[PDB]
Amino acid sequence: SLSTEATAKIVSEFGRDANDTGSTEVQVALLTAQINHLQGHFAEHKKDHHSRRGLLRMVSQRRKLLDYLKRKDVARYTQLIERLGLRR
Amino acid sequence: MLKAGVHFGHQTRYWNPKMKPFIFGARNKVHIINLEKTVPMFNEALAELNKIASRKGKILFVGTKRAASEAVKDAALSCDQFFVNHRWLGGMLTNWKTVRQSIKRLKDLETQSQDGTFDKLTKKEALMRTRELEKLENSLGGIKDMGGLPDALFVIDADHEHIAIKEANNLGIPVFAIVDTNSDPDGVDFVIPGNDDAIRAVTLYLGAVAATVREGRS
Amino acid sequence: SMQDPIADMLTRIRNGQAANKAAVTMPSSKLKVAIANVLKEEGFIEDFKVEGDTKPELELTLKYFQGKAVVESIQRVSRPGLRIYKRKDELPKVMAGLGIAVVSTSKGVMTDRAARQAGLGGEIICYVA
RNA sequence: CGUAAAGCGCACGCAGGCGGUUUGUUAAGUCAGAUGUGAAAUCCCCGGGCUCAACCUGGGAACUGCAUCUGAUACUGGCAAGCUUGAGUCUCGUAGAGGGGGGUAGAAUUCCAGGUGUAGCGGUGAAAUGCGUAGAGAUCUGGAGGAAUACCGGUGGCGAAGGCGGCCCCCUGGACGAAGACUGACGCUCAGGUGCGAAAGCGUGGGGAGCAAACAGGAUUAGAUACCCUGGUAGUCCACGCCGUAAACGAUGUCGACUUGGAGGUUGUGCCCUUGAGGCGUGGCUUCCGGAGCUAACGCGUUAAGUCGACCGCCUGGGGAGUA
């Protein structure tokens, strides 16, 4: 998947601290990082239909977590999707 | 505790999960029967078995495998009781009717044999008839003087003699079996977790049973 | 996923009676302890015991009368797919009275005899026959 | 609903259905009571009158409902707060024909050029067509080209399914294991919808060694539009798009829980003299046989076709017809 240094950087940016690596913002940001990186991979190749299935699992799982965090705390939702530049 | 000196259980292979209450089960892939469970079981079997033995009943030891022979002939015949030591015929209890006339032919042919006309009229047919007495004598050996179907049944291996257990359950006869860890307590009314194929174990074992049979009211 | 833990409990007891099992453990809850108290009270199980602190574990010591098993047929009636709420007049008797039906009434989890005597119906959880 | 008709080819997922566990509040569902109403006749019950009966009739019950008010709060729902046993994230490794792109290697077939060499070669049940003194076949050397990747190779592995087999690099998906940390029900299923989906086929552009529908010849045969033989085009191969199906099959939907065993395979991990190709456990996936149970039987049998729960799909005699 993603680099150890990259995952550590995103956990450090979005968590309450390091070791808070399962929080909803953190998981969303890690999924987001990998989705964008693989936008770069699937612009090329384009017939890697197996890897894409992994990618659509990432998209769907991000969506589930955004729905959770939307119906738990909406302020965290707006700050989160504001910071990640998603939602369009 | 130790009446059962030397057997401690057997049968690594084809062990049966229904023998799980009776297994201590440690050493070298083989299963050890919990003989601290066997001793109350075997004392109960001696209790009810002596109880029917004192009511003037017939017991029918069953000893087809070797060397249960002649240990079942020795133990049954040490009492005034009955036995099967060679191949147990399929249906000598549940059609005893037809087996009654085979026993009748054994009696008529031994009476004809050692007393009557045995040298009469042929040598070849006389040899034929004598080996009919060997076949009818080793198959219908102990049971030939029974004259009823018996009041209990004592089998020495439950899986090897499943036919006799199946028939005595079919007829309402109390089955007294020494099961091993491969056997199954089918309809054995008085199960005894022991060792079926050790001659020390079955001579000790039948020694105790034949000891408690030959105490009636006396 | 687990969506009916009560039917899971009754499944544990059917398959424990069917396997000559001495005792049955499961995760515990308030409703399972209520039902289990009704079953001990009516004589279908021998005892229950809830252990653990942070993850409670209900344990039902089962009954066997003869070689046969005591709980002859336990069924789940008000499943989550379709819930069944009977009044005090519609409240059924199982095996013509020889077998209780555990109904959750507002006063608590009772039997059919006890809640028909109390004068109030409710949600009929399970037939124990 | 394995084989009788019936499990979508496989997944992702919206609306929908269902939802672990604890406490508090509400009381919508649920329950109890009350009130209003539910026309009369009819049905039912207990009586009465026609000589009886049908019939007529008195009183009740009933009209299983709806609305409102009063309560109960166990279950379900709403709301608030949690909790970790479900789900997920992070750390470290492991195995793998998982995918896509690029390169390369060795055997072999065909073709071309050349040397030797000479009368057959090939083929079949037998033959003939075919190739061959214009020198075939055999054999050696050099070259070109395309496709596939022996041995390993294994009821072995990976993948949702279709499927994926030289070796190397690059990009990339998933699974599993060990200890610990974190989030805290974030879950399950899924009509419409969307995606992937062997082979054959279609479109455009390449490629084309072998194999080979069509086709042609030779046989066989009563005939032979076949099986067999000799050739042989599309196709099979590549790029991009379409199609959208298969005995797409474990003829077995997905997810979760429980219920006796035995022998293996494969991939992790922990412990013990590792005193070796050991001993004891603990996971993941998988093969064979079998117990209870189930099953019309056959068989399935902890990877269920057993015992349950959630949601979906489908069936309703054969044909006509999966056709118009």
Curated annotation (Swiss-Prot), chain A:
Family the UniProt entry places it in: Belongs to the universal ribosomal protein uS15 family.
Induction context: Part of the metY operon that extends to pnp, also has its own promoter.
Pfam family, one: Ribosomal_S15
One GO term of the biological process aspect: regulation of translation
Listed NCBIfam families: S15_bact (TIGR00952)
GO MF entries: rRNA binding; small ribosomal subunit rRNA binding; structural constituent of ribosome
Official protein name in the record: Small ribosomal subunit protein uS15
Classification via SMART domains: Ribosomal_S15
Keyword Phosphoprotein set for record: no
Subunit structure comment from the entry: Part of the 30S ribosomal subunit. Forms a bridge to the 50S subunit in the 70S ribosome, contacting the 23S rRNA.
GO cellular component terms, semicolon-separated: cytoplasm; cytosol; cytosolic small ribosomal subunit
Lineage of the species this protein comes from: Bacteria, Pseudomonadati, Pseudomonadota, Gammaproteobacteria, Enterobacterales
Gene expressing this chain: rpsO
Free-text function comment from the UniProt entry: One of the primary rRNA binding proteins, it binds directly to 16S rRNA where it helps nucleate assembly of the platform of the 30S subunit by binding and bridging several RNA helices of the 16S rRNA. Binds to its own mRNA, stabilizing it 5-UTR and preventing its translation.
Keyword match rRNA-binding: yes
Entry keywords, A to Z: Ribonucleoprotein, Ribosomal protein, RNA-binding, rRNA-binding, Translation regulation
Curated annotation (Swiss-Prot), chain B:
Protein name, entry field: Small ribosomal subunit protein uS2
Keyword Ribonucleoprotein recorded: yes
Signal peptide residues on this chain, from the entry's feature table: none
Family per record: Belongs to the universal ribosomal protein uS2 family.
Primary gene name: rpsB
InterPro entries from the UniProt entry: Ribosomal_uS2, Ribosomal_uS2_bac/mit/plastid, Ribosomal_uS2_CS, Ribosomal_uS2_flav_dom_sf
GO cellular component: cytoplasm; cytosolic small ribosomal subunit
Cited HAMAP family: Ribosomal_uS2_B
Modified residues (N6-succinyllysine): 107
Its job: Required for ribosomal protein bS1 (rpsA) to bind to the 30S subunit.
Subunit and partners: Part of the 30S ribosomal subunit, contacts bS1. Some nascent polypeptide chains are able to cross-link to this protein in situ. In collided ribosomes contacts ribosome rescue factor SmrB.
Cross-referenced Pfam families: Ribosomal_S2
UniProt record, GO biological process: cytoplasmic translation; ribosomal small subunit assembly
Keyword vocabulary terms for this entry: Ribonucleoprotein, Ribosomal protein
From Swiss-Prot, chain C:
DNA repair as UniProt keyword: no
Keyword rRNA-binding among record annotations: yes
One Pfam family, short name: Ribosomal_S8
Single annotated GO MF: structural constituent of ribosome
Alphabetical GO biological process terms: cytoplasmic translation; regulation of mRNA stability; regulation of translation; ribosomal small subunit assembly
One of the record's GO cellular component terms: cytosol
Gene3D superfamilies for this protein: 3.30.1370.30, 3.30.1490.10
UniProt keywords, alphabetically: Repressor, Ribonucleoprotein, Ribosomal protein, RNA-binding, rRNA-binding, Translation regulation
Subunit composition and interactions: Part of the 30S ribosomal subunit. Contacts proteins S5 and S12.
Similarity comment: family membership: Belongs to the universal ribosomal protein uS8 family.
Role this protein plays: One of the primary rRNA binding proteins, it binds directly to 16S rRNA central domain where it helps coordinate assembly of the platform of the 30S subunit. Protein S8 is a translational repressor protein, it controls the translation of the spc operon by binding to its mRNA.
Name of the protein this chain belongs to: Small ribosomal subunit protein uS8
Species the sequence originates in: Escherichia coli (strain K12)
Gene: rpsH
